[PDB]
Amino acid sequence: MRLNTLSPAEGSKKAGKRLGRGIGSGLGKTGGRGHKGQKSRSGGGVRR
Amino acid sequence: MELVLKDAQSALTVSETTFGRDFNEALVHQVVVAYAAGARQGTRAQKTRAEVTGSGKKPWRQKGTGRARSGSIKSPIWRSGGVTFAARPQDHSQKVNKKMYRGALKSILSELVRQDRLIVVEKFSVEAPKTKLLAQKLKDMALEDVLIITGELDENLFLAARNLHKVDVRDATGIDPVSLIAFDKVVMTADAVKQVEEMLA
Amino acid sequence: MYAVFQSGGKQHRVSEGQTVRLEKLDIATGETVEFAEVLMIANGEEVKIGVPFVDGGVIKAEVVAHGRGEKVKIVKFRRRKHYRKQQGHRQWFTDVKITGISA
Amino acid sequence: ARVKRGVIARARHKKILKQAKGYYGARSRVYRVAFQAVIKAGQYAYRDRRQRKRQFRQLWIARINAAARQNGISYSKFINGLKKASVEIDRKILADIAVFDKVAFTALVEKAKAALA
Amino acid sequence: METIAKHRHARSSAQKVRLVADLIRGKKVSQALDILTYTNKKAAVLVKKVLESAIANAEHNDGADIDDLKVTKIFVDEGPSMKRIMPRAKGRADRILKRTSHITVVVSDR
């Protein structure tokens, strides 16, 4: 039991999405926002 | 269970739930991580396009110049512009449930006695506050990197250990999860272990 | 004298003492492998063309070495479609030395 | 935790420019042009690993056709004769024999003519 | 025994000096000095002073004789450019580059 031997539980620290970081990431160039329209814009989207 | 003393060669009874439970690595890891986060100061900041010193004047007109349209000399695209998501002074401290904190100490203490990294003595003190004496005493016990936990914090023992790098003294109430893991050996007096059991139920 | 045998889904025209690279055989290095599937044996104007395989024709070889071929890069790319992927590849081979061609 | 990109960016730009050695002009000097040239080169290489198998078979067939007509038979009747004679020598070997061993190739034509006749 | 002389920050563009440099590349120094004497170029005066200074270095520092020296290597590299502003019509400005060059002459008997 050392400071460089402790490990988190399996499946407890899922990595977050990082949008717009190339083709291989699967979220590049649009960040999963589609192509155009109100919902693709920064701060876009309709109220509740 | 019994904790055999090093000098008196007598056993000391302790709660099996405190010193004899399994090692919950996932639980200990969260508490160790949260302790390091609590040490963060988090004092930093950058300037957004609002805080950068400059004018709100449009650098050149919207159309006709043949250049890319610009609206502010403070834009993050520009050199000397603001930072897009400039940081603010934040607080990185996490919450640890009381039972998860205490549950991690029990898992650490029970792991120490399993690694024979916990040494129990009836008493531990020095006559004068002189680091030469304490350094000699630990050499007799074949200890170099050790955390010493006592019942009552003696000033002489505290002063004698201040200059020793790999040694630190601690009250029974002042133990923390990362200290119990960071040091090679942990020496606890018979009074300290008694006070730790009351702390950990 | 040379012979034609089939191994690894391909055919080879080899002669005695020649080293030929085949696909990966599950034979340890230094062992002797037999090719009882000989399609043709030519020996000084005396040629043996065989129905299926030459009757009795056997080729003895020595497994010289195993290894992986040169790395080839696979590049797939669809222009204007935001898609591309790369992949390497090294083909396993087995070098054998033709020790004897038995008619 | 500011991260300067200089070291890793130069490393991957050199990786592309190294694969573009020998290309003409900016295609071996500037990254923007070299990167397109390397991608296009990979596309061609993938396509031509399939085309290579067609071009060589096309070459073997042409050589077999020439050597067969030197013996008085066309490639079509020669291949059909070998299959009727249960000979399974492929075209890479037949083209190889047709060049380096004429007498063995003539023996194959005799075998093919017999299965037809 | 190679001997070098340089004129760094020579007030002339490298393209203009290179026209004179290739006239004497490989020639004997006696023949090169005559070529530079009757070349109606400003760069010919610059190259001549570097050439004869390389001849002096070869004979004074290396003890070589003038009769065997040859221009084995000569090249003109670009020096720093001085940026200047030239006003054009209708309030527009152009940046004028006053180019310089580094002239290098290498004489040798071998």
Next chain:
RNA sequence: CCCCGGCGAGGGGAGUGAAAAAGAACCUGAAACCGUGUACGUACAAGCAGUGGGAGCACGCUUAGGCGUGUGACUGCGUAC
């Protein structure tokens, strides 16, 4: 200090220093861009300039190893992102 030069600029020696390819336009010194040298190709040849095949030449080998490296006549396919 000496030499070339206009009692220049600049440079070559000498000397200092662990280093002067640390010389003040001074740590490291990338890329674009511009040159000198060498090898090969190139003046009857049509196009995203590569790719597959491939002679020849040069060179390193090993060494009769018949491999590596550079170049690429000729030829199939091929309209950048």
